[PDB]
């Protein structure tokens, strides 16, 4: 559950990410596949060649999905229902993988935005990703 303070930290930090969302998306996904090889089992059709157009295209969609969530913090299940159908009903992704991707996204944001990634903003982003992860692993329709 997000506090009013968490909501502000998220909205503020997301402003600073600007137009590079897509590129951070792709890097977090690449860090995931390399550091946690069992995750590739969910993408048997991907080319995992560094900088692949597929991974690039995928990172873009993930960062669009996060931008949309930041816009709908008071109704995540509302905003993300289609992605929940995909991950929870169709793909049946083990919730453990969500913690791995969330961690890789934090690693990536800290890597590019060290001065914005203060301990308090790190705390609020971790909670943001945990909340997003619950929704995408829950069957609620």
């Amino acid at each position: 559950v997000l506090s009013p303070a968490d909501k502000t930290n998220i909205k503020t930090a997301w402003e600073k990410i600007g137009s590079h969302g897509g590129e951070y998306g792709a890097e977090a996904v690449e860090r995931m596949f390399l550091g946690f090889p069992t995750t590739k089992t969910y993408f048997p059709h991907f080319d995992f060649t560094h900088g692949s157009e597929q991974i690039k295209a995928h990172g873009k969609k993930v960062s669009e999905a996060l931008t949309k969530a930041v816009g709908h913090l008071d109704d995540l299940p509302g905003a993300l229902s289609t992605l929940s159908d995909l991950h929870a009903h169709k793909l049946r992704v083990d919730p453990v993988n969500f913690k791995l991707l969330s961690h890789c996204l934090l690693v990536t944001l800290a890597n590019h935005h060290p001065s914005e990634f203060t301990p308090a903003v790190h705390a609020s982003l971790d909670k943001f990703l945990a909340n997003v992860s619950t929704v995408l692993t829950s069957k609620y329709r």
Partner: protein, 146 residues
Amino acid sequence: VHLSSEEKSAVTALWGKVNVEEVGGEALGRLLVVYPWTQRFFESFGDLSSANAVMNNPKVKAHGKKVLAAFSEGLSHLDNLKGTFAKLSELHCDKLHVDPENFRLLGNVLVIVLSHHFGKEFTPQVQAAYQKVVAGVANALAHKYH
């Protein structure tokens, strides 16, 4: 934990650049901020009721230093983590009752802090080798539960 020479060189090269005072304090400090139930284990350090109090607290920096020094030791003993960490596992598991999942969280926070400090140099490939290392250390700390 089994690293190729490629992985080991990478971990070691980066680790030689680490300021242990600084990095350990920032890792332990972020642990206590991001995962606030962990503050219960460190109640004797004083007030930890805010980010700013946690990160200016001298016992937190001094303790972060002891934690990282123990990590450095684990790094030159990767093929004997269990024997190296035996008494430390006994203390955390038997005397302090620290649930093992908290060892994993502190390992991941240390990876965040390395990324924060080193930028581009902490490549996906260097990260991947560090994940093997922190999981090895977390496992060693938890073995007294097994």
